[PDB]
């Protein structure tokens, strides 16, 4: 009997989380997340494909959350700080995308140490 | 720094170049060279203005902004002959046809 | 990875300064590793940053609304030298000294529509010369061409 | 330096040096041909189709040429009006310039 939804209070967690994490603007006003949404496809970037085991963007991220395939914060946490390292692993230390996911890791630290101080 | 000329008589454009600091007197002694006629016989003007032989270039108004190399400064030119001041005479140079429709 | 012009793959990053030193708004091209034409982000006139690339990756840089070709450290392609001791690599965009007979045929292109060309008073050789329009790809061919003719 | 003399087909006479003249093809091949009497090179050319305010602008652009190619200097364009635009096209055609 696992068809069970996350209780309502989880899921508002978990988008509030990542809304914060995507809505998240640099002091100049860009939106950090943009290029982390979509991943290229296999055809515009293979080479992203043959060293990222495990691809992963935002909308698959959301898309976790609304099939209630995280069954915990941390679970979310995992593919957030995956796609983060996926990015990293990638792009490697010097490109702007590197820069912007430790960022985005921080942010999402931020956003769920507000939702803990929240509850308790 | 660099400024570049057209030294004007009647039907006659003498295309060259000075530094800024560069005389008068100097710019004379460049027309010298090409139509063989000493600084005495020659006036430089201005538009009107008859340019004096110890100023520079730069203090009669040809700069690097006004005297480039794709839009050169004119300056006029007229000759003494002796006893003889001829008027300061550029002819204009012709003129293009209207703009065709096509191109506005 | 197939063609003599395109990026290597090095995953070698490099840092890069991108000065347009032109009156004409930049497109920047880098050349994939198949060594296809990809466009970047516009540069206005007088305007400089500094971007992330890797080492052996290929740029050109053209007008943005012409496509004609521009230079970077007075030649056609750039491609950053060793990233030594942290310094950035700089990339300085002009314009070239044009042939009066091209730069004459940009501005009729700028001032007169493809479709009314044939409708200039001029010789019927010189239609073809404006409809010969700048291309990136005519370029790398020409490029190409020079270095495998080079190789000898 | 050497000079030559360029005239228009309206008779306007340029002068300009020979270095700045050898840019166009067209005059190159003119003035290495031979000369009068004894000389072995030309210094004046006369163009029967070109008139005075579209040879005086060639002349700006072999000034322009040799200015600013292979320079380190900023590059400025070489600017054209649109009256003059056609003519302009039509002399450097044939002076391959
Ligand atoms: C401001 C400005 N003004 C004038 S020019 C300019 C400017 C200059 C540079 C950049 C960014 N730099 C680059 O793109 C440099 C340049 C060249 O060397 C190639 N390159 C690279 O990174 C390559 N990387 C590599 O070779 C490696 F990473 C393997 C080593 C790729 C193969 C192209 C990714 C810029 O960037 C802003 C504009 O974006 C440029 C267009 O690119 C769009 C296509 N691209 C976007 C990023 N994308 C990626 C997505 C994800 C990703 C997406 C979702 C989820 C997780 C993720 O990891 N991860 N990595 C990516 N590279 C792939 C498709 C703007």
């Known amino acids: 009997e696992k068809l069970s939804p996350n209780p309502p209070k989880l899921t508002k967690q978990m988008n509030a989380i990542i809304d914060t994490v995507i809505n998240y603007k640099d002091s100049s006003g860009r939106q950090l997340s943009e290029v982390f949404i979509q991943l290229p496809s296999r055809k515009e970037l293979p080479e992203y494909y043959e060293l990222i085991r495990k691809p992963v963007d935002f909308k698959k991220i959301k898309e976790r959350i609304r099939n209630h395939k995280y069954r915990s914060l941390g679970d979310l946490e995992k593919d957030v700080m995956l796609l983060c390292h996926n990015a990293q692993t990638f792009n490697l230390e010097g490109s702007q995308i590197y820069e912007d996911s430790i960022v985005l890791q921080s942010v999402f630290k931020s956003a769920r140490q507000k939702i803990a101080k929240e509850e308790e | 720094m660099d400024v570049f000329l057209m030294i004007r008589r009647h039907k006659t454009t003498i295309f060259t170049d000075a530094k800024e600091s560069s005389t008068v007197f100097e710019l004379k002694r460049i027309v010298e060279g090409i139509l063989k006629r000493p600084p005495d016989e020659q006036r430089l003007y201005k538009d009107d203005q008859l340019l004096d032989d110890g100023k520079t270039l730069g203090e009669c108004g040809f700069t690097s902004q006004t005297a480039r190399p794709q839009a050169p400064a004119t300056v006029g030119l007229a000759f003494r002959a002796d006893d003889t001041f001829e008027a300061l005479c550029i002819e204009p140079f012709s003129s293009p046809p209207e703009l065709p429709d096509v191109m506005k | 990875p197939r063609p003599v012009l395109r990026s290597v793959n090095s995953r070698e990053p490099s840092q890069v300064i991108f000065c347009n030193r032109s009156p004409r708004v930049v497109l920047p091209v880098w050349l994939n590793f198949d060594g296809e034409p990809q466009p970047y982000p516009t540069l206005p006139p007088g305007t400089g940053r500094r971007i992330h690339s890797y080492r052996g990756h290929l740029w050109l840089f053209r007008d943005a609304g012409t496509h004609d070709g521009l230079l970077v450290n007075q030649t056609e392609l750039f491609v950053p030298s060793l990233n030594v001791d942290g310094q950035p690599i700089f990339a300085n965009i002009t314009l070239p000294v044009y042939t009066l007979k091209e730069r004459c045929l940009q501005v009729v292109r700028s001032l007169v529509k493809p479709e009314n060309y044939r409708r200039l008073d001029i010789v019927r050789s010189l239609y073809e010369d404006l409809e010969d329009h700048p291309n990136v790809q005519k370029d790398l061919e020409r490029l190409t061409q020079e270095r495998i003719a080079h190789q000898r | ?97």
């Open chain 4, 1 to 97: 330096m050497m000079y030559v003399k360029l005239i228009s087909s309206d008779g306007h006479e340029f002068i300009v040096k020979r270095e700045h003249a050898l840019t166009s093809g067209t005059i190159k091949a003119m003035l290495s041909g031979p000369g009068q009497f004894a000389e072995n090179e030309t210094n004046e050319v006369n163009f029967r189709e070109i008139p005075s305010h579209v040879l005086s602008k060639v002349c700006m652009y072999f000034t322009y040429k040799v200015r600013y190619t292979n320079s380190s200097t900023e590059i400025p364009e070489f600017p054209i009006a649109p009256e003059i635009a056609l003519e302009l096209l039509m002399a450097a055609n044939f002076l391959d310039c």
